Ligand SMILES: C=C(CC)C(=O)c1ccc(OCC(=O)O)c(Cl)c1Cl
């Protein structure tokens with residue numbers, strides 16, 4: 001087809017950021033949910049997954065796997081990856097920091113109960129003292145509406161997406177970072193993003209106990 | 222200066238792949254080793270590390286952090302990132318799989334003693350059954366000397382680098398993969414790579430107990 005088919009579990013997981021990028025880009029996509037391990041095996045046996053895993057994203061005739069390979073293609077294809085090689089360097093540096101913090105928040109649900117309070121406290125300390133300050137500082141420096149090159153880029157989409165997850169964790173964290181708050185509002189008002197934020201869009205809900213059990217069953221983790 | 226300064230601990234760690242890429246590219250670089258936590262704090266306080274961590278790589282007037290942002294810039298700057306957007310998608314998909322397997326091998330030293338035999342057995346099973354087969358299959362498909370676009374790219378450098386580490390883990394693993402063995406030899410004979418492989422080059426040795434203690438001291442992990 002002409003629409004990108006995203007293959008994954010019906011959840012946030014590792015496919016969510018791809019969803020935010022496609023939507024922010026204004027691209028319509030289909031989602032082929034993996035309901036059972038039989039489904040995942042069918043794909044593996046069909047030879048659609050190079051490294052046996054998902055996310056997988058049928059786009060432009062390719063069966064792309066590995067989150068970063070997917071995001072990189074999409075971001076490039078829709079002019080969300082900066083203008084030159086030097087801009088892409090700043091974007092990559094910002095979004096890999098975002099991806100680091102985000103990987104911590106993502107694994108929190110499957111964190112050992114005895115650790116959960118410490119991991120959560122570690123994460124709040126990195127947000128307050130390391131990442132938010134860094135990004136606030138970038139916005140404060142050029143005083144422009146966007147993080148890189150005074151134009152919308154994947155850096156803004158990925159950052160704002162993280163700002164929502166952090167809000168769900170503790171709304172007070174962003175309070176001392178006015179420029180980040182501003183960016184959150186600003187990007188949230190873009191017609192494409194605003195539509196993704198509304199009810200009924202393919203945006204996914206935070207994971208709970210019920211869905212986590214179904215997932216670690218199929219994927220086994 | 223005109224030469225890239227790599228700031229890191231005197232070890233393989235997270236900076237090694239940058240070393241293999243620069244060298245394979247034929248670029249000369251300086252290394253400013255971090256001998257003590259005082260050194261690492263000096264950098265942090267000087268404001269050279271955006272997210273407070275290293276590797277950090279002064280290149281082209283930028284102070285790049287985050288391994289992938291660094292590798293991406295270098296690979297682009299020296300024409301090792303494919304010709305078009307679709308080639309970069311295959312490269313990214315291959316090298317992120319390589320980076321996954323590689324992250325497992327990298328953490329093996331700091332793995333809990335009770336686990337070490339299982340992690341090591343897990344890793345040998347993924348190599349034999351998932352990654353090597355996948356890459357052997359790519360080479361077998363186009364029957365060309367390189368992984369992507371019949372030209373040398375970062376995919377070849379990063380793969381071969383991993384082939385060495387796997388050799389150090391168990392030389393028998395690659396035996397059933399003749400095309401990978403071939404690629405290992407072929408890339409190892411490129412004048413630039415061959416020079417990096419020789420004694421005295423900035424290539425780093427596998428980590429031992431002595432150096433691991435010094436490192437987790439400074440970096441604290
Ligand atoms: C919340 C999570 C629990 C660790 C999580 O991030 C996660 C990891 C892998 C998953 O699928 C497999 C995949 O390949 O992503 C899924 Cl569905 C989730 Cl939700």
Ligand SMILES: C=C(CC)C(=O)c1ccc(OCC(=O)O)c(Cl)c1Cl
Pocket residue numbers: 230232233234235274275276327328330331428436440
């Ligand atoms: C062997 C290792 C032990 C876990 C390892 O990969 C590692 C991790 C971080 C390290 O520095 C800090 C950094 O930011 O990379 C270093 Cl020097 C090493 Cl060797």
